[PDB]
Design a protein around this ligand. Structure first.
Ligand code: CLA
Ligand code: CLA
Ligand code: CLA
Ligand code: CLA
Ligand code: CLA
Ligand code: CLA
Ligand code: CLA
Ligand code: CLA
Ligand SMILES: CC1=C(/C=C/C(C)=C/C=C/C(C)=C/C=C/C=C(C)/C=C/C=C(C)/C=C/C2=C(C)CCCC2(C)C)C(C)(C)CCC1
Ligand SMILES: CC1=C(/C=C/C(C)=C/C=C/C(C)=C/C=C/C=C(C)/C=C/C=C(C)/C=C/C2=C(C)CCCC2(C)C)C(C)(C)CCC1
Ligand SMILES: CC1=C(C/C=C(\C)CCC[C@H](C)CCC[C@H](C)CCCC(C)C)C(=O)c2ccccc2C1=O
Lengths: 80, 42, 48, 152, 742
């Protein structure tokens, strides 16, 4: 299972949550931004590594980071 | 006339005109002076 | 093919190769006309 | 004279090469009629070859053992025209081009969207800028002395 | 019903849209932020389906582009004719075609390139051409240069007319959508009008102009003494002296006693001994029959009247054992999108071009064409390459249609769904077939090489140790040889001399045609051809079928048609789009065509071409070493690549030197392509960062920030350079060899 981390530079535009193809990220209430929300990655075990969340993130550098890690049946995208 | 002049100033047209003029000048210079290996004027 | 045109060709066999050679020479010299001296900068106007 | 090289007028292989070239040209020249244009073209080629060899002999180059001219880039005063003078000319031309380009870039940097000026050049401004390159060494030297050449 | 529908002045002609680049797309029209903008401006120029959504504008743009292409083609033809008229030795070559080499280009005398003016012959110096235009002009009956000048002027006029027509049909009167969607009338006019009438007119020209002039030329008459073509039309006495049937006039044609025209409408077949080509009477007869057939077949579809057939009715009312209801909604699909039609036409044109090359090399239709080897080689290779490229493009357009124009709700077809529901079995079977064919075909060669390298020549697959003969091809050859005796009583001889059986035909001391033997080497090369074709088909079919979705990526259609990948996840998803499949199949098409042309060249040089002495012995160019040296890879490398490259590398200082230079230059380009195929974008971007810093230090930073090329752009550049380098290398080698030795 890969590792997905979220930093505090997020502005809560909800693009990463919409971009995820396996329902890994969601949004929670927060306090330190105008949008009053921040993303989170509870369902880490379902990540495949497509890095679409990093593709859709407006910041100087990404506030969501994906590090590849130990692979399994789910992360390898195998249907057989 | 304004739009035609603006189009004529685009990069490929100016480039091809400049390079055609340069090639013509070089060809004519090499025709007037056939061969050249060293600078003999001095 | 009626052997009268063949006889005409035999009679006029000469000067036909001459015409062919002249045409070929003109076709070749069409590129070297300036280097030869003729068709110089004057008289290029509506010429050659 | 230098590095065991022979002056090109003295060397015999140079004349041998000229003889081979002339014979090769005449071999093809013999085919066509004397009045035909190809004969005139081949005669012009022969005259050009003779003139080229005469000029190469006159200019004082040094052929090697194989009979071909060699170039000396030492800086010897007897061979300054082979390398040094064309080098100076090339440096002048390249400096002209670079100075003109940099001046145009700095001139168009002021506007709000210089990209549209780069993709669509304006002709009057470039024409005004181009002729300032005739004095590029003086301007470059003065700008270096002042301190405007290098960005800070 | 069928009607003419147009719109008046849909667009206004002005130069305001010329000033601003990229007006077709708003994103491009916004302005250049980085350099990538420029690279986009040329990529989306011709993608009319993405500029808008209305079919009418796309159809009008397509029509105008067709008109412009026709104008360009006419300009090219006019230029070729003018070069033939002015700078050429056509008149000298006409009298002595065997001993004079055609030439239609003259090089200037600026730098020293005058060595390129070789001694072609006939008191002329120039570059020898291999386009085969001189044979066409001779077969058309042209015996002077004024006619060529007139043809060039007419070509210029027609090009101007085509350009004006394109402008008029885009900016003044543009047809509506219903005009383009009338396929029955278009088919009727293309079959009866474009094809039948043109061939009928050409047959009339051949009957009235080409045959008498060619008969006079073949008799031995000087070209300057032949009567002008209009004299035959004006003077019926001349034609009566030539062909007595014309004395009867057109009365026999209406009298149905057509046998009287047997003098200039024959069915003999074979090659003409004098010129080594097909009989012109047979060609005129074939054109007349084809005209009749096309004129009859052009009245099949119902347009504006009661009689006729409906294409939709024919498709829907089709019932069969394996098909079933089948073709129900195919008419709407074919009449809705341009990409399906483009793919079908591209594939058909490629197949037709390959067939054309084969039929042209087998039976020479022009006089003095078989004995000119360079022309034959150039025509064969050129047509093969064109056909391969078209066949490749067909699959790409099919994938484009399947990606962006396919919806199963509004327009549903049963056959397409059935095919899409079992793609795994098709792919698996094709993969197995490719693996089996490749294993056997290449293992035979590797076994031969290993057995020959170990001093065991009795264990190889050769004509002497273990024989694998093409029995079916030999049976077909024997049947074709025996065909005119009993099966085709009308023909005097067989269609071609290739079939095993008959006599040898040679013109002017050089072999024209003789029967071609078949052995183990032909077996092996044919199987290699089949293997390569199967692999290319597998690649293209896998690209087409899995375009919408896949087991790995279930939503590939949302990403589009041209995307690099999906990400580093799932183990890696590089090159999953159909564009990557086409880019990969280009390499295999190149490989297959190269193998085919190499086989053709070596076999023709070894077993057919040659010279004949007065005694009657035939000496071939390479002395028949194909049957024993082409069974191993070392033989292919030594007796073909090493032996036949002597001429190209030794061409320096002669009139062929240019070819040698190309033989080097193409090589360079090939290596250059590797730089774009082995690396990635990040390294180049990181290097450009430091270069941009070094620029910034001296205040020469451009507003358009430099950017490295995109992944798709890099792949396209690499494949383009690879193909160009390989093709140019083969071109230079072939031309140098066939000009220096033949
Ligand atoms: C790829 C194809 C290929 C083929 C077909 C051959 C074939 C041959 N090789 Mg060569 N060889 C090859 C490549 C190939 N080679 C390569 C790549 C190398 C390495 C460089 C060599 C090196 C080599 C050596 C060193 C030698 C040979 C020799 C031989 C022969 C030995 C045959 C044998 O003993 O085993 C055959 C064994 C079998 C079990 C046959 C299996 C196939 C059966 C028939 C399957 C058919 C399937 C059937 C249709 C299934 C349907 C099912 C249905 C009924 C339900 C044979 C003619 C030997 C020789 O001396 O010959 C003169 C020898 O010493 N070969
Ligand atoms: C690009 C600039 C250029 C320049 C400066 C020259 C300069 C010159 N030309 Mg060239 N020329 C050029 C391009 C150029 N030409 C082109 C593009 C063509 C093709 C039409 C020619 C064809 C040409 C001809 C046909 C002739 C010249 C001649 C001359 C000379 C006239 C005095 C002079 C050396 C004339 C000359 O003096 O020849 C003796 C001459 O007759 N030129
Ligand atoms: C299919 C395209 C085509 C191509 C590739 C060529 C190619 C060529 N032409 Mg031809 N030509 C064409 C069509 C074409 N022509 C047409 C339609 C006409 C009728 C107007 C001509 C009339 C023509 C003439 C009158 C001449 C050529 C010549 C030339 C050569 C030199 C061109 C030059 O240097 O211009 C210089 C470039 C610019 C002015 C810019 C070049 C091999 C020249 C030649 O071969 O001289 C030895 C020459 O004299 N051409
Ligand atoms: C019998 C008359 C007729 C003829 C001769 C043609 C012939 C042609 N059509 Mg077709 N067409 C016709 C009827 C006809 N059409 C009708 C009724 C329709 C409407 C359903 C169409 C719809 C159509 C389309 C939508 C397109 C064509 C295209 C073409 C061209 C194919 C290019 C090519 O193969 O090179 C062959 C090259 C030559 C023979 C050039 C010779 C020039 C010809 C003879 C021009 C005269 C043709 C015209 C129909 C008559 C003029 C009428 C006007 C003056 C009032 C070719 C010129 C394609 C094309 O290339 O577009 C330009 C194209 O896109 N056609
Ligand atoms: C495809 C177009 C075509 C055209 C335009 C012509 C044109 C002509 N034919 Mg030809 N002809 C053709 C095809 C064609 N032919 C074919 C396919 C054959 C083989 C059967 C012939 C065989 C032929 C014969 C046997 C005769 C002609 C004759 C004529 C000429 C007399 C004019 C006339 O009667 O009206 C023709 C029709 C229109 C112009 C409309 C005329 C030049 C007559 C002749 O010899 O005159 C010189 C004549 O006796 N033709
Ligand atoms: C019969 C004509 C034909 C037509 C009308 C089209 C039409 C179309 N094609 Mg298809 N195609 C065809 C045949 C055709 N194709 C063939 C034979 C192939 C196989 C190679 C393809 C493969 C193909 C691909 C892979 C793609 C298309 C796409 C497209 C669309 C974009 C066109 C474009 O922007 O190019 C504008 C022109 C260029 C970009 C010029 C590129 C430079 C070329 C490659 C260089 C050739 C160099 C020259 C021969 C060598 C001399 C060098 C000298 C200049 C120094 C357009 C609708 C593109 C698309 O996006 O579709 C939606 C796309 O991605 N086509
Ligand atoms: C010359 C080098 C080369 C070789 C040998 C191959 C080989 C192959 N390619 Mg690849 N390919 C190459 C370069 C090469 N490619 C390049 C440059 C590209 C461009 C990117 C591609 C792109 C490509 C694509 C796009 C595809 C392939 C596919 C294939 C396979 C075709 C099926 C088949 O023929 O297998 C039969 C086997 C052979 C021909 C290989 C040689 C085997 C010989 C006979 C030796 C066997 C001897 C023995 C068993 C060894 C035992 C010794 C050991 C015990 C010590 C095969 C594995 C196709 C595929 O995989 O589908 C099936 C496919 O779709 N290739
Ligand atoms: C198996 C395929 C076959 C094929 C493709 C052909 C093909 C052909 N036959 Mg042959 N023929 C065949 C078998 C075949 N034949 C057999 C089995 C017989 C014995 C009955 C004949 C007896 C035969 C006769 C009697 C004639 C032809 C003729 C023809 C030619 C003109 C066709 C036409 O009438 O329209 C054409 C080359 C015609 C001909 O030779 O005209 C040139 C003709 O008169 N054929
Ligand atoms: C080469 C070339 C060219 C030229 C061309 C030409 C010259 C053409 C011509 C053409 C022609 C010249 C054509 C014609 C046609 C014709 C036709 C198509 C006809 C038809 C007819 C008919 C159909 C008939 C009918 C009938 C009958 C059946 C019977 C009786 C009655 C009648 C008579 C009605 C150009 C420069 C352009 C371009 C480049 C190339
Ligand atoms: C393959 C190819 C090619 C070629 C082409 C060609 C060679 C074509 C031709 C074409 C042609 C060759 C065409 C023709 C056409 C024709 C027509 C279109 C006609 C028409 C006619 C008419 C219309 C008539 C009418 C009439 C009269 C006049 C009389 C009687 C009545 C009537 C009404 C019938 C090239 C090289 C370019 C390259 C690419 C590809
Ligand atoms: C070499 C290389 C580059 C670098 C290539 C670049 C930057 C292309 C440069 C093209 C030209 C030479 C740049 C300049 C173009 C202007 C028109 C120049 C105008 C000035 C005068 C010459 C007129 C990549 O960006 C790349 C990306 C992805 C995979 C492989 C590669 C790759 O192999």
């Amino acid at each position: 299972s890969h590792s997905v981390k979220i930093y505090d530079t997020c502005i809560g535009c909800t693009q990463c949550v919409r971009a995820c193809p396996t329902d890994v990220l969601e949004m929670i209430p927060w306090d330190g931004c105008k949008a009053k929300q921040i993303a989170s990655a509870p369902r880490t075990e379902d990540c495949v590594g497509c890095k679409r969340c990093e593709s859709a993130c407006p910041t100087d550098f990404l506030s969501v980071r994906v590090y590849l890690w130990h692979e399994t049946t789910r992360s390898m995208g195998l249907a057989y | 006339m304004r739009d035609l002049k603006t189009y004529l100033s685009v990069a490929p047209v100016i480039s091809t005109l400049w390079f055609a003029a340069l090639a013509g000048l070089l060809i004519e210079i090499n025709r007037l002076f056939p061969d050249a290996l060293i600078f003999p004027f001095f | 093919v009626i052997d009268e045109y063949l006889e005409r060709s035999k009679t006029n066999k000469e000067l036909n190769d001459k015409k062919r050679l002249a045409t070929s020479g003109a076709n070749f010299a069409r590129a070297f006309t300036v280097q030869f001296g003729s068709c110089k900068f004057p008289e290029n106007f509506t010429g050659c | 004279d230098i590095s065991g090289l022979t002056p090109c007028k003295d060397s015999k292989q140079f004349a041998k090469r000229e003889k081979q070239q002339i014979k090769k040209l005449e071999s093809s020249l013999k085919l066509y009629a004397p009045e035909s244009a190809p004969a005139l073209a081949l005669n012009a080629q022969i005259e050009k070859t003779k003139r080229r060899f005469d000029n190469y002999g006159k200019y004082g180059l040094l052929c090697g053992s194989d009979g071909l001219p060699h170039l000396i880039v030492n800086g010897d005063q007897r061979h300054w025209g082979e390398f040094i003078t064309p080098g100076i000319l090339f440096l002048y031309i390249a400096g002209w081009i670079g100075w003109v380009g940099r001046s145009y870039l700095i001139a168009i940097s002021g506007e709000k969207k210089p990209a549209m000026k780069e993709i669509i050049i304006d002709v009057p401004l470039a024409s005004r800028i181009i002729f300032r390159g005739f004095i590029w060494p003086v301007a470059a030297y003065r700008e270096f002395l002042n301190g405007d050449l290098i960005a800070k | 019903e069928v009607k003419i529908l147009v719109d008046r002045d849909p667009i206004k002609t002005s130069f305001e849209e010329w000033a601003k680049p990229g007006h077709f797309s708003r994103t491009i029209a916004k302005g250049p932020d980085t350099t990538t903008w420029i690279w986009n401006l040329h990529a989306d120029a011709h993608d009319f389906d993405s500029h808008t959504s209305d079919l009418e504008e796309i159809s009008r743009k397509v029509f105008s582009a067709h008109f412009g292409q026709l104008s360009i083609i006419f300009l090219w033809l006019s230029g070729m004719y003018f070069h033939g008229a002015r700078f050429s030795n056509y008149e000298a070559w006409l009298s002595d075609p065997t001993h004079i080499g055609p030439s239609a280009q003259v090089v200037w005398s600026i730098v020293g390139q005058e060595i390129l003016n070789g001694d072609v012959g006939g008191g002329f110096r120039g570059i020898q051409i291999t386009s085969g235009f001189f044979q066409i002009w001779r077969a058309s009956g042209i015996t002077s240069e004024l006619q060529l000048y007139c043809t060039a002027i007419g070509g210029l006029v027609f090009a101007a007319l085509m350009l004006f027509a394109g402008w008029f049909h885009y900016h003044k009167a543009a047809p509506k959508l219903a005009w383009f969607q009338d396929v029955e009338s278009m088919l009727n006019h293309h079959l009866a009008g474009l094809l039948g009438l043109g061939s009928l007119s050409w047959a009339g020209h051949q009957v009235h102009v080409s045959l008498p002039i060619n008969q006079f030329l073949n008799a031995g008459v000087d070209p300057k003494e032949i009567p002008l073509p209009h004299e035959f039309i004006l003077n019926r006495d001349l034609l009566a002296q030539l062909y007595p049937s014309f004395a009867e006039g057109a009365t026999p044609f209406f009298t149905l006693n057509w046998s009287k025209y047997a003098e200039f409408l024959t069915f003999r077949g074979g090659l003409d001994p004098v010129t080594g080509g097909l009989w012109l009477t047979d060609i005129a007869h074939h054109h007349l029959a084809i005209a009749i057939l096309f004129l009859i077949a052009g009245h099949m579809y119902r347009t504006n009247w009661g009689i006729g057939h409906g294409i939709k009715d024919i498709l829907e009312a089709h019932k069969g054992p394996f098909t079933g209801q089948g073709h129900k909604g195919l008419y709407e699909i074919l009449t809705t999108s341009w990409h399906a039609q483009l793919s079908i036409n591209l594939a058909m044109l490629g197949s037709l071009t390959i067939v054309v090359a084969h039929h042209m090399y087998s039976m020479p239709p022009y006089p003095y064409l078989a004995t000119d080897y360079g022309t034959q080689l150039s025509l064969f290779t050129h047509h093969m390459w064109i056909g391969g490229f078209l066949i490749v493009g067909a699959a790409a357009h099919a994938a484009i249609f399947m990606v962006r124009d396919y919806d199963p709700t509004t327009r549903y077809n049963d056959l397409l769904d059935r095919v899409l529901r079992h793609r795994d079995a098709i792919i698996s079977h094709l993969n197995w077939v490719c693996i089996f064919l490749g294993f056997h075909s290449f293992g035979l060669y590797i076994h031969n090489d290993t057995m020959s390298a170990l001093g065991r020549p009795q264990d190889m697959f050769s004509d002497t140790a273990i024989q694998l003969q093409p029995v079916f091809a030999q049976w077909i050859q024997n049947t074709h040889a025996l065909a005119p005796g009993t099966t085709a009583p009308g023909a005097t001889t067989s269609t071609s001399l290739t079939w095993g059986g008959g006599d040898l035909v040679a013109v002017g001391g050089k072999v024209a045609l003789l029967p071609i033997p078949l052995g183990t080497a032909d077996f092996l090369v044919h199987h290699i051809h089949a293997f390569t074709i199967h692999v290319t088909v597998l690649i293209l079919l896998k690209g087409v079928l899995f375009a919408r979705s896949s087991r790995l990526i279930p939503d590939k259609a949302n990403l589009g048609f041209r995307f690099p990948c999906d990400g580093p996840g799932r183990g890696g998803t590089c090159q999953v789009s159909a564009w990557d499949h086409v880019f990969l199949g280009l390499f295999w098409m190149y490989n297959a065509i190269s193998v085919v042309i190499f086989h053709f060249s070596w076999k023709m040089q070894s077993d057919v071409w040659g010279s004949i002495s007065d005694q009657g012995v035939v000496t071939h160019i390479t002395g028949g070493n194909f049957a024993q040296s082409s069974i191993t890879i070392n033989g292919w490398l030594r007796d073909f690549l090493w032996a036949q490259a002597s001429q190209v590398i030794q061409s320096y200082g002669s009139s062929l030197s240019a070819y040698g230079l190309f033989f080097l230059g193409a090589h360079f380009v090939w290596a250059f392509s590797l730089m774009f195929l082995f690396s990635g974008r990040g390294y180049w971007q990181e290097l450009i960062e430091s270069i941009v810093w070094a620029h910034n230090k001296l205040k020469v930073a451009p507003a358009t920030q430099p950017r490295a090329l995109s992944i798709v752009q890099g792949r396209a550049v690499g494949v383009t350079h690879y193909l160009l380098g390989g093709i140019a290398t083969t071109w230079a080698f072939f031309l140098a060899r066939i000009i220096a030795v033949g």
